[PDB]
Amino acid sequence: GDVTVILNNLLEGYDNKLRPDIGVKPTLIHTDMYVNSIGPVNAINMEYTIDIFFAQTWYDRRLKFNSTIKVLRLNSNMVGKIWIPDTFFRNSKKADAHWITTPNRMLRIWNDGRVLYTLRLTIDAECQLQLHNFPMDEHSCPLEFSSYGYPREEIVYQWKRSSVEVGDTRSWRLYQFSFVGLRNTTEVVKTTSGDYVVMSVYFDLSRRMGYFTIQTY
Amino acid sequence: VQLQQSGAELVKPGASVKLSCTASGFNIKDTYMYWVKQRPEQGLEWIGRIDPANGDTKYDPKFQGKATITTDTFSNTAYLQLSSLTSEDTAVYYCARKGLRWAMDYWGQGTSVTVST
Amino acid sequence: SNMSLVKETVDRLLKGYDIRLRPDFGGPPVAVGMNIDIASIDMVSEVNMDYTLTMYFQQAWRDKRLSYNVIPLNLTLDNRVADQLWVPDTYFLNDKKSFVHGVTVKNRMIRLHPDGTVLYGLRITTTAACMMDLRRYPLDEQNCTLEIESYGYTTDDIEFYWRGDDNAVTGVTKIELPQFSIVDYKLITKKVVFSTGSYPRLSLSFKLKRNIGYFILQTYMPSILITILSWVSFWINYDASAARVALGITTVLT
Amino acid sequence: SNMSLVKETVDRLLKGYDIRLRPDFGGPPVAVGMNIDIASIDMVSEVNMDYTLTMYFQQAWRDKRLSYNVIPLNLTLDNRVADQLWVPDTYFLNDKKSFVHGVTVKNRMIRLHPDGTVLYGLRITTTAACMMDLRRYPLDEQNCTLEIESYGYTTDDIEFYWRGDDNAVTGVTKIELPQFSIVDYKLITKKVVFSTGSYPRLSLSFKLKRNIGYFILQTYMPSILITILSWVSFWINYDASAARVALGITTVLT
Amino acid sequence: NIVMTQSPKSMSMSVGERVTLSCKASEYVGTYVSWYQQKPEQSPKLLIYGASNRYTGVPDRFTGSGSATDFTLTIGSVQAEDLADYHCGQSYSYPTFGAGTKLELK
Amino acid sequence: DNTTVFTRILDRLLDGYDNRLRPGLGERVTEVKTDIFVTSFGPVSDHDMEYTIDVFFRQSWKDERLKFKGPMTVLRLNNLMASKIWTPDTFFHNGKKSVAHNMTMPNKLLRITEDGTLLYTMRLTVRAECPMHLEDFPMDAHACPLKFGSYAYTRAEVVYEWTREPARSVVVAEDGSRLNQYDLLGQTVDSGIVQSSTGEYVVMTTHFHLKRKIGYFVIQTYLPCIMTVILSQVSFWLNRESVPARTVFGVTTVLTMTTLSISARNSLPKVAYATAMDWFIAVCYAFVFSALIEFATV
Amino acid sequence: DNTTVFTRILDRLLDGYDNRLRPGLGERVTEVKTDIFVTSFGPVSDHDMEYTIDVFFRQSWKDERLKFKGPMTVLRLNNLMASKIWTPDTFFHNGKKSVAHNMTMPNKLLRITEDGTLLYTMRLTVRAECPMHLEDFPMDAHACPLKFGSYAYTRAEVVYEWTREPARSVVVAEDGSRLNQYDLLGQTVDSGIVQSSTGEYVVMTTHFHLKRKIGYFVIQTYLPCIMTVILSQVSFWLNRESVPARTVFGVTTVLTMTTLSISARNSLPKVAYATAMDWFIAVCYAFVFSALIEFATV
Ligand SMILES: *[C@@H]1O[C@H](CO)[C@@H](O[C@@H]2O[C@H](CO)[C@@H](O[C@@H]3O[C@H](CO[C@H]4O[C@H](CO[C@H]5O[C@H](CO)[C@@H](O)[C@H](O)[C@@H]5O[C@H]5O[C@H](CO)[C@@H](O)[C@H](O)[C@@H]5O)[C@@H](O)[C@H](O[C@H]5O[C@H](CO)[C@@H](O)[C@H](O)[C@@H]5O)[C@@H]4O)[C@@H](O)[C@H](O[C@H]4O[C@H](CO)[C@@H](O)[C@H](O)[C@@H]4O[C@H]4O[C@H](CO)[C@@H](O)[C@H](O)[C@@H]4O[C@H]4O[C@H](CO)[C@@H](O)[C@H](O)[C@@H]4O)[C@@H]3O)[C@H](O)[C@H]2NC(C)=O)[C@H](O)[C@H]1NC(C)=O
Ligand SMILES: CCCCCCCCCCCCCCCCCCCC(=O)O[C@H](COC(=O)CCCCCCCCCCCCCC)COP(=O)(O)OCCN
Ligand SMILES: CCCCCCCCCCCCCCCCCCCC(=O)O[C@H](COC(=O)CCCCCCCCCCCCCC)COP(=O)(O)OCCN
Ligand SMILES: CCCCCCCCCCCCCCCCCCCC(=O)O[C@H](COC(=O)CCCCCCCCCCCCCC)COP(=O)(O)OCCN
Ligand SMILES: *[C@@H]1O[C@H](CO)[C@@H](O[C@@H]2O[C@H](CO)[C@@H](O[C@@H]3O[C@H](CO)[C@@H](O)[C@H](O)[C@@H]3O)[C@H](O)[C@H]2NC(C)=O)[C@H](O)[C@H]1NC(C)=O
Ligand SMILES: *[C@@H]1O[C@H](CO)[C@@H](O[C@@H]2O[C@H](CO)[C@@H](O[C@@H]3O[C@H](CO)[C@@H](O)[C@H](O)[C@@H]3O)[C@H](O)[C@H]2NC(C)=O)[C@H](O)[C@H]1NC(C)=O
Ligand SMILES: *[C@@H]1O[C@H](CO)[C@@H](O[C@@H]2O[C@H](CO)[C@@H](O)[C@H](O)[C@H]2NC(C)=O)[C@H](O)[C@H]1NC(C)=O
Ligand SMILES: *[C@@H]1O[C@H](CO)[C@@H](O)[C@H](O)[C@H]1NC(C)=O
Ligand SMILES: *[C@@H]1O[C@H](CO)[C@@H](O)[C@H](O)[C@H]1NC(C)=O
């Protein structure tokens, strides 16, 4: 009906290669998560699997419409036509989105240009476990992400107050460890390209004794 | 939205009665169509359902052969025909469509059949 | 506004652009400068004779067609414009399995400068193959390398060089390996000659030295203790023939 | 020229061609004839209950829209024109991981004929599922199939049939497996019924008889000889308490 | 055939007090239990479709509570027009209703 | 020449169609009637706590923008038409790595009925997660779930529902059992609503009840344990003069029990509690150790 | 404006080009000149009867539709231009899973000479088959083939040839050898004509002569077997009044021979005949058992 007219007017004269406010100010991106399950922490490879619902919301004054409807709720068919930040996880050995049955993505464009972009991810993050005190050892190892090509002067990330929210913590595949808490952190790192805003989420794992008690001791 | 059943019937024992249920407000091809009986001061009882898009009809094991359920897509009507009836099934027959969570949201009004001489 | 100016500049740069032609298609070769930031050397297998490394591979050339002067800032375009520009056909000769990470988007950067300089970065995970000489295992030092060569363009069409020549590769001193230890690394620039032409080449050669503590604790100590358990059989008197045979035989089997 | 004439013919054929509609979209079903040239049966795994086979899967139907009467030669087009024709939606029901070989190009063949007949070959490698009854292992004869069914089109829209009906599947007598040995193979034609219709199906069935040489070599002879060794404990005098016990215990734990 | 034992058979209660009805299924019925309110000389009206989901137009004093087999219909401040039969019927399989409970005022 | 008239019908259908808008965006909630046909229940990986399942995932909604009037009633179209219309984005809440088969063509289907009723089936291989409580190993029974819902469409927009009676929606083929270790008992479906930070979503659940087969564990753990215990108690009937024989009996039985415990614990995931087989092996270890202690006392 | 004139040349070159018709479709037979440069001869897997190889596959034909006159003689164009012209569909007749490297860009090369001659080079890893007869294991020698021809183009349409002398076509790099266990002796090329169900094709064959190295199998099997035989023969020089010692010698030497025979069989594929190492292990087992039986007789 008229939503088609709105969507057509939003994409007329739109360049998805230019971030919103390309030459004015950095783009503030608010990041939230929803940890489904923290997969097996295998010490042999110094890695651990995690499955999340990554949500990013920013402001785009070009996707600003004026109609009775307040919010536009869309599937992944219009994700490749607007600007989308290039968030990558800096300590992920291998990670991939989900594609069955349809690409697991969500796009919600509010009335004042506020965009929400959510996708489902399975990250095999890396953390060098200090394997002393084994098996009486405790680790707290992170999940870091940042923009790839945009330095601090262009893209700034920022956690929300209630950003990271774990699930049930019972149907997780944490066999030898036990989830005790988390904490978010923001810093700035230096690279050959520029200065980047690196966000981190630290998960606190405590190795529960058992298997080794009955396997070797 | 509005289900209109037939009127009351006064049938002699040993005959066949064909009750009609005209659906106004929707298309019967979208949902199922259940037929329910209720004897006086007793619980509801299922007879059978029909999928008007195909014609697949299921019946209660104790109503198999006695009743048959057909449809009519042109007039949006469901028919229930009691093949051979004794003097015991003098109940009220309701016509219902399936709702949201497989419930029966919209019922008819009841065609109270009566078997006597 | 500034956004309209940037949009018009980019639309001018990408309009009338031929991807099939390298910069200076008739004149001198283009000079591509390489940077590498090694994130990690993951696993070094003696059975597959290969190692895995994750790096931030970055190249920098000068395309005089993508030059602008109306705005003073360095444009950082979306990584989808790298399919419309010209990028050099750099390939690794001794890789087996490689892939650019693609979450949440294809991990690459494409950043223009007002003087034409293009900056093109990737995040690669290569399983480079390095043959190991195990004649001195486990007291051995392996030299695993990574060779970077141009495929399509000969040496009169492209020139490879490291940017800085000693700071081109960073992040080596931070690499911790569970079994080896990076002694040093060398950066070499040479040319190879095939049947089709002479091509430029760079080489990043690490010199991994294997640790010995694990081997001592795992397989040298048990050997010494088994030989000593064999020697104890000398204190047993020669009259007991079922004890010395037992001991010696068991030690042989061990 | 002949080349320009053929190009004009092909452009005429593909112009106004609707790929969404099968040949005879409102009429009788189309007949698709199957051929298989089995290249190899790679591995027959008892732990995954699967088996990998590489085949040259060819289908032949008759499209009246691709009919030309200007040139008298059987046209052979590039394998990329198959993305612009209609090809039947054939799928293997009991496959787990399969691929069309893509080197140096996608290994497929498209070949028209002046009367509309289309030939269409692929080089597939299917890891089909082979549920085995191991109650006689290793003296067992297995039987696992390859079900070839059309996905979208019911039996009133497509008709599967082996081309030749006995020479359809070739290359079976050249298959050399390291362990099994093909005893017999059969070709079947059925019409399975699902809740969405009745779809045609072809079945290619082998009968693999396992060879017993490897097991006689590896697992029967050691157990037999261990029993023979155990029998030695009777020729020793009954006064030896350690010797005989050593025999029986070693034998029991081996 | 899944049978629904509804209890009690007939209860009498005064106005303004909390009342509860129980419907125990024989086999498993996940949450496909519906509650119907049949007033005398009328056709049954759907109250709770699925377990614990009020139908459009039902006052907020009706609440369902679901499980695998045991189900409950609780009425809060009971008014004077809530004097009717209350049938529970599963739909996980071919629909079978309960016997119903004649609610009364005293 | 029915090709031209059918091409015209199709081009009229797609003329002025927006696949970014769900059917009935303003005045309706889309009703997706799903269904499943399990062609083969794959092997339950006990190590990864996963299980594989090969399905014919069927969906069917009502699109009023795809009404036509021609000679045919049902348009059995190609699977490439399904990409130009709106199709629900059903995702599996616990699937790990699902694949959609592309051999030899995309294993999909699309039938547009003349009144707008669509039908869209896919052939999937879902590798879902089945959390297991291995406290009765190897006499345990599990209920492996399969939860699927919508992405980006809350409950006020897209509601899911089974297409037949919920007891008859998930059907399993007779010969479709790749289970060599377990034993599939029956399915059990259910429909609920999960709250979230983004909205309220409809979630359809399906539990496959399993039951482990104890034959292999018997043969490879319980018989060797019992036989070792018997071989250990054999050391009591030997005379007291033969000391080395009884010493060998005791030591070798203790070693055999140790290696049996190790090999029995390797099969299971690295779990941090004690299973039933663990208690059995502990008691057998205690018996052999007590036999050795008794010989030492003698 | 030099880029402009070259863009004009490249646009005039593909103006009216049909990449679905081979050069000289009805008037001639295409002549693809082939060359191979093995950069690394990969590891020969004995279990899968396969071997990996890493080549620079060069092809060259003459396309008269690509004649051009300009300032340059050859056009060293990108690898994406090769997707807009006709390129022969060469495939490896005995390949299992070959990959065409595209790191960082697609590894390809296209040079259009001014007289129409094309040069098209790829870099690709081929995992080919190599059936082996292991009756002389571990002293066997193999000839692993690498057959390649065209797909869909019979002998009347596309014929292959070697570009240089057939002896000097398949070149191997000096340091290009990842053979841990084998030893590459030399290559041997040949051309032939095979017949399929579709037509009569040209097949270009290349054999790589390999010779296994015996160093590893000596130290792992033949030395332990001999040392066990010697240990079993030491039992004679013992006195005839020490029964436990000689019995232990015998039972341990036998058990060791059994274990050794199992591990030694573990290395090779599961063939149904007896190799040479198996014959050696059998004779050693005979000797050991005979020594045990000689002690029993004594
Ligand atoms: C070396 O060579 C390698 C091999 O060539 C190469 O890898 C290939 O890379 C390319 C590009 O990176 C990949 O192509 C992209 O894939 C994206 C998603 O990839 C996922 O899915 C593919 C399989 O793709 C099928 O499934 C998805 C999801 O359903 C579909 O969206 C696809 O169309 C496709 O569907 C067909 O096939 C299905 C069977 O699988 C059928 O069921 C179906 O019916 C179709 O027939 C997987 O293979 C991927 O896995 C691989 O890649 C990941 C990457 O991380 C690896 O981790 C992993 O290990 C594997 O290697 C992965 O799972 C596509 O989204 C993408 O298409 C979009 O983007 C392009 C470019 O922007 C657009 O032009 C295009 O139109 C698509 O955008 C539309 O759709 C999106 C949907 O999200 C919309 O948001 C968007 O707005 C746009 O909508 C518009 O257009 C629509 C029509 O297109 C229209 O409907 C809308 O209305 C709107 O108008 C692109 O296809 C390719 O898969 C890789 N292949 C392999 C084998 O890896 C590698 O990069 C090379 N390396 C180098 C260094 O060069
Ligand atoms: C020293 C190391 C030795 C290693 C090798 C030793 C091997 C022993 C060889 C000697 C002969 C043993 C005879 C065993 C016969 C075959 C066993 C097959 C077992 C089997 O498959 O049966 C399962 C039943 O398990 C059950 O139901 C089992 C229930 C109870 C188990 C048996 C209890 C034994 C108690 C003995 C007491 C003695 C103590 C006094 C000294 C199958 O079951 P399914 O689920 O697959 O299908 C059927 C539904 N059940
Ligand atoms: C339904 C059954 C449930 C039981 C489950 C667990 C039980 C496991 C152990 C049970 C084994 C059976 C014990 C039967 C023995 C009875 C006969 C004993 C004869 C006797 O009286 O003499 C004693 C001989 O010592 C002995 O008999 C030696 C006993 C050794 C002590 C126990 C060792 C336990 C091992 C712990 C380590 C292993 C843990 C595994 C993780 C010493 O008595 P005396 O000197 O007074 O003689 C004067 C008495 N007329
Ligand atoms: C059970 C416990 C024992 C296990 C524990 C240790 C075992 C004992 C080891 C201690 C001392 C042994 C010293 C032997 C030196 C190591 C042998 C290295 C083998 C090797 O690399 O040589 C291969 C050649 O051997 C050949 O050409 C092989 C041909 C002949 C093999 C030797 C057998 C001769 C028979 C002995 C007669 C005994 C008579 C008694 C009545 C190389 O091969 P390449 O291809 O890499 O390069 C050369 C082309 N061949
Ligand atoms: C699954 O199988 C289908 C059908 O075999 C594959 O669809 C094919 O995908 C390729 C690449 O996306 C299409 O080629 C493209 O054609 C367009 C012109 O429309 C061209 O501009 C592109 O550059 C590209 O060459 C091809 O047409 C398409 N075939 C059909 C019949 O739709 C699909 O790619 C397969 N998916 C996977 C993951 O293997
Ligand atoms: C391997 O196993 C398959 C699966 O059972 C065997 O296929 C079976 O083959 C027989 C004989 O070819 C078929 O019998 C036929 O039944 C039809 C039914 O109308 C009848 O018309 C024919 O005259 C004949 O009696 C049988 O249907 C078929 N089974 C299935 C499920 O299709 C196969 O024979 C076995 N052997 C080999 C070497 O693969
Ligand atoms: C996640 O990050 C946010 C923002 O940095 C943290 O929120 C702050 O929490 C502290 C103490 O709870 C307050 O004093 C600040 O006012 C909060 N800031 C904002 C912007 O809300 C939050 O604590 C972090 N969550 C953790 C560490 O679990
Ligand atoms: C662009 O990059 C160059 C690289 O050194 C830097 O000097 C310059 O300041 C950058 N532009 C701006 C506007 O900062
Ligand atoms: C085309 O093929 C058919 C059958 O394969 C054959 O009979 C015919 O001769 C071929 N055409 C030509 C021109 O050879």
CATH number of B40's domain? 2.60.40.10
* Burial state string for G194-231 with b = 16 or more CB within 10 A and e = fewer than 16: eebbbbebbbbbbbbebebeeeebeeebbebbeebbeb
Q: Which residues contact F286 (CB under 8 A, 6 or more apart)?
A: none
Radius of gyration of the CA atoms of chain E, in A: 13
Are residues B101 and F161, on separate chains, in Cβ contact within 8 Å? yes
In the listed set G196, G213, G230, which residue is the last one of a domain according to the structure? Answer: G213
Q: How far is CA F222 from the centre of its chain?
A: 29
Question: What is d(CA D9, CA D69) in angstroms, rounded to the nearest whole number?
Answer: 9
Nearest CA-CA distance, residue A77 and chain F, Å: 6
Provide, as residue numbers in chain C, all residues whose Cβ is less than 8 Å from the Cβ of G71: 26
Question: What is d(CA E83, CA D11) in angstroms, rounded to the nearest whole number?
Answer: 79
Closest chain F CA to residue A163: F197
Provide, as residue numbers in chain A, all residues whose Cβ is less than 8 Å from the Cβ of C79: 86, 148-149
Q: How far is the CA of A71 from the centre of ligand 5 (A)?
A: 34
In a shared domain, residues G223 and G182 = no
Radius of gyration of the CA atoms of chain D, in A: 28
Cβ of residue F286 lying under 6 Å from some atom of ligand 3:
yes
Q: How many domains does chain B divide into?
A: 1
Nearest-CA neighbor of G276 among G234, G221, G231, G209?
A: G221
CB distance B23 to B3 below 8 Å: yes
CB distance F65 to F85 below 8 Å: no
Cβ of residue F285 lying under 6 Å from some atom of ligand 3:
yes
Provide, as residue numbers in chain B, all residues whose Cβ is less than 8 Å from the Cβ of E34: 99, 101, 103-104
Q: How far is CA C121 from the centre of its chain?
A: 14
Closest chain A CA to residue C60: A193
Angle made by CA atoms G20, G25, G28, in degrees to the nearest 5: 150
In a shared domain, residues G208 and G239 = no
Angle made by CA atoms G284, G287, G293, in degrees to the nearest 5: 145
Handedness of CA A40, F196, F58, B49 (dihedral sign): positive
> Whose CA is closest to atom 22 on ligand 7?
A161
Query: Tokens 């289900």 correspond to what residue?
Result: B3
Residue D158's domain spans which residues?
1-211
In a shared domain, residues F75 and F220 = no
> Whose CA is closest to atom 31 on ligand 4?
G218
Backbone gaps in chain D, preceding residues (C–N over 2.5 A)? none
Q: How far is the CA of C148 from the centre of ligand 7 (A)?
A: 46
Q: What is the DSSP pairing of strand F201-209 with strand G30-45? A: unpaired
Cα atoms in the 13 Å half-sphere on the side-chain side of D137? 7
| Residue F249 burial (10 A CB sphere; 0-12, 13-18, 19+) | buried
In a shared domain, residues G221 and G96 = no
Residue E76 forms contact with F (CB below 8 Å) = no
Tokens representing G76?
A: 């060293």
CB distance D185 to D172 below 8 Å: yes
In a shared domain, residues F119 and F226 = no
Is the backbone peptide bond immediately before D154 cis, with ω within 30 degrees of 0? Answer: no
Question: What is d(CA G156, CA G145) in angstroms, rounded to the nearest whole number?
Answer: 25
**C-alpha torsion angle, residues G182, G185, G186, G187 (rounded to 10):** -30
Which residues pair with residue F74 across a beta bridge?
F113
Are residues D178 and G49, on separate chains, in Cβ contact within 8 Å? yes
In a shared domain, residues G90 and G228 = no
Nearest-CA neighbor of F160 among F113, F205, F116, F118?
A: F205
CB distance B95 to B32 below 8 Å: no
CB distance G191 to G203 below 8 Å: yes
Nearest-CA neighbor of F148 among F191, F202, F93?
A: F93
In the listed set F196, F213, F230, which residue is the last one of a domain according to the structure? Answer: F213
Q: What is the DSSP pairing of strand F50-59 with strand F120-129? A: antiparallel
CB distance C21 to G70 below 8 Å: no
Provide, as residue numbers in chain B, all residues whose Cβ is less than 8 Å from the Cβ of F191: 101
In a shared domain, residues G52 and G102 = yes
Q: How far is CA B95 from the centre of its chain?
A: 5
Segments of chain A assigned E as strands = 27-35, 37-42, 47-59, 71-74, 87-89, 92-97, 105-110, 114-126, 138-147, 155-166, 179-190, 195-206
Residue B27's domain spans which residues?
2-115
* Burial state string for C162-184 with b = 16 or more CB within 10 A and e = fewer than 16: beeeeebbeeeeebebeebebee
| Residue D196 burial (10 A CB sphere; 0-12, 13-18, 19+) | middle
Q: Which residues contact A202 (CB under 8 A, 6 or more apart)?
A: A140, A141, A142, A182, A183, A184, A185
Question: What is d(CA D150, CA D86) in angstroms, rounded to the nearest whole number?
Answer: 14
For residue A203, give Cα distances in angstroms to A123, A183, A200, C223, G18.
14, 7, 10, 43, 59
Question: What is d(CA F244, CA G287) in angstroms, rounded to the nearest whole number?
Answer: 30
Counting ligands in written order, which one lies closest to the CA of residue C112? 8
Q: Which of B26, B27, B28, B30 to mutate to test the interface with F (most CBs of F within 10 A)?
A: B30
Nearest-CA neighbor of C86 among B89, G81, A133?
A: G81
SS3 label, residue D167? coil
φ and ψ at residue D179, rounded to 5 degrees: -115, -55
Are residues E30 and F166, on separate chains, in Cβ contact within 8 Å? yes
Q: What is the DSSP pairing of strand C158-162 with strand C30-45? A: parallel
- The reply, when asked if residue C68 is annotated as ligand binding, is no
Question: What is d(CA A123, CA A141) in angstroms, rounded to the nearest whole number?
Answer: 14
> Whose CA is closest to atom 12 on ligand 3?
F287
Q: Which residues contact B58 (CB under 8 A, 6 or more apart)?
A: B48, B49, E94
Segments of G12-92 assigned E as strands = 30-45, 50-60, 75-77, 90-92
Residue type, B41: E
For residue E8, give Cα distances in angstroms to C35, E69, G174.
81, 17, 93
Q: How far is the CA of A159 from the centre of ligand 7 (A)?
A: 8
CB distance E103 to E83 below 8 Å: yes
Q: Which residues contact A70 (CB under 8 A, 6 or more apart)?
A: A110, A111
What structural domains does chain E harbor?
4-105 (2.60.40.10)
In a shared domain, residues G87 and G220 = no
CB distance G42 to G126 below 8 Å: no
Cβ of residue G185 lying under 6 Å from some atom of ligand 4:
no
Nearest-CA neighbor of F288 among F242, F239, F226?
A: F226
Q: How far is the CA of D12 from the centre of ligand 9 (A)?
A: 22
Q: What is the DSSP letter of G64?
A: G
Question: What is d(CA C101, CA C95) in angstroms, rounded to the nearest whole number?
Answer: 16
Subunits touching D (CB < 8 Å, at least 3 pairs)? F, G
Closest by Cβ to G131, choosing from D176, D235, D244: D176
In a shared domain, residues F83 and F161 = yes
Residue F143 forms contact with B (CB below 8 Å) = no
Provide, as residue numbers in chain F, all residues whose Cβ is less than 8 Å from the Cβ of E93: 165-168
Q: How far is the CA of A77 from the centre of ligand 5 (A)?
A: 18
Cα atoms in the 13 Å half-sphere on the side-chain side of G128? 24
In a shared domain, residues F11 and F154 = yes
User: What was the elucidation method?
Assistant: cryo-EM
Are residues B104 and E87, on separate chains, in Cβ contact within 8 Å? no
What is the DSSP track for D188-250? EEEEEEETTEEEEEEEEEEEEEPP-HHHIIIIIHHHHHHHHHHHGGGTS-TT-HHHHHHHHHH
Are residues F278 and A214, on separate chains, in Cβ contact within 8 Å? yes
Counting ligands in written order, which one lies closest to the CA of residue F225? 2
CB distance E44 to B34 below 8 Å: no
Cβ of residue F287 lying under 6 Å from some atom of ligand 3:
yes
- Give, for ligand 7, the residue of A35, A161, A186 to mutate: max count of ligand atoms closer than 8 Å to Cβ: A161
- The reply, when asked if residue D150 is annotated as ligand binding, is yes
Q: At what angle do helices C241-253 and G243-267 cross, to 10 degrees?
A: 10
Closest chain B CA to residue E56: B105
Are residues A87 and C104, on separate chains, in Cβ contact within 8 Å? yes
What is the number of H-type helices and E-type strands within chain D? Answer: 4, 12
Tokens representing D133?
A: 């009854």
| Strand (E) or helix (H) holding F243 | helix F243-266
Residue G121: other Cβ atoms inside 10 A: 23
Closest chain F CA to residue E29: F190
Tokens representing G11?
A: 């646009």
Q: At what angle do helices F276-297 and F243-266 cross, to 10 degrees?
A: 170
Q: How many domains does chain F divide into?
A: 2
Which residues pair with residue C147 across a beta bridge?
C203
- The reply, when asked if residue D67 is annotated as ligand binding, is no
Nearest-CA neighbor of D240 among F248, G291, F298, G230?
A: F248
Tokens representing B57?
A: 């009809």
CB distance D130 to D66 below 8 Å: no
Q: What is the DSSP letter of F179?
A: -
In chain B, which among 1-30 make CB contacts under 8 A with chain F? 27, 29-30
For residue C254, give Cα distances in angstroms to C182, C248, C250, D247, G227.
35, 10, 6, 19, 14
CB distance D24 to D61 below 8 Å: no
Provide, as residue numbers in chain F, all residues whose Cβ is less than 8 Å from the Cβ of E28: 188
In a shared domain, residues F253 and F112 = no
In the listed set F161, F187, F213, which residue is the last one of a domain according to the structure? Answer: F213
| Residue F138 burial (10 A CB sphere; 0-12, 13-18, 19+) | buried
CB distance G142 to G170 below 8 Å: no
Question: What is d(CA D170, CA D56) in angstroms, rounded to the nearest whole number?
Answer: 10
In a shared domain, residues G197 and G238 = no
Nearest-CA neighbor of A81 among A180, A29, A155, A10?
A: A10
In chain C, which among 92-111 make CB contacts under 8 A with chain G? 92-96, 98-100
φ and ψ at residue A157, rounded to 5 degrees: -90, 160
Q: Which of A53, A96, A101 to mutate to test the interface with F (most CBs of F within 10 A)?
A: A101
Cβ of residue C113 lying under 6 Å from some atom of ligand 8:
yes
Radius of gyration of the CA atoms of chain C, in A: 28
Residue G15's domain spans which residues?
1-213
Question: What is d(CA A144, CA A200) in angstroms, rounded to the nearest whole number?
Answer: 4
Nearest-CA neighbor of D204 among D122, D144, D143, D145?
A: D145
- The reply, when asked if residue C91 is annotated as ligand binding, is yes
Query: Tokens 């008739």 correspond to what residue?
Result: C26
Are residues F271 and A120, on separate chains, in Cβ contact within 8 Å? no
| Strand (E) or helix (H) holding G283 | helix G276-297
What is the DSSP track for G205-243? EEEEEEE---HHHIIIIIHHHHHHHHHHHHHHHS-TT-H
Nearest CA-CA distance, residue G215 and chain D, Å: 24
Tokens representing F204?
A: 């359809």
Are residues D253 and F252, on separate chains, in Cβ contact within 8 Å? yes
Question: What is d(CA G65, CA G13) in angstroms, rounded to the nearest whole number?
Answer: 8
Q: Which residues contact A84 (CB under 8 A, 6 or more apart)?
A: A16, A117, C104, C105
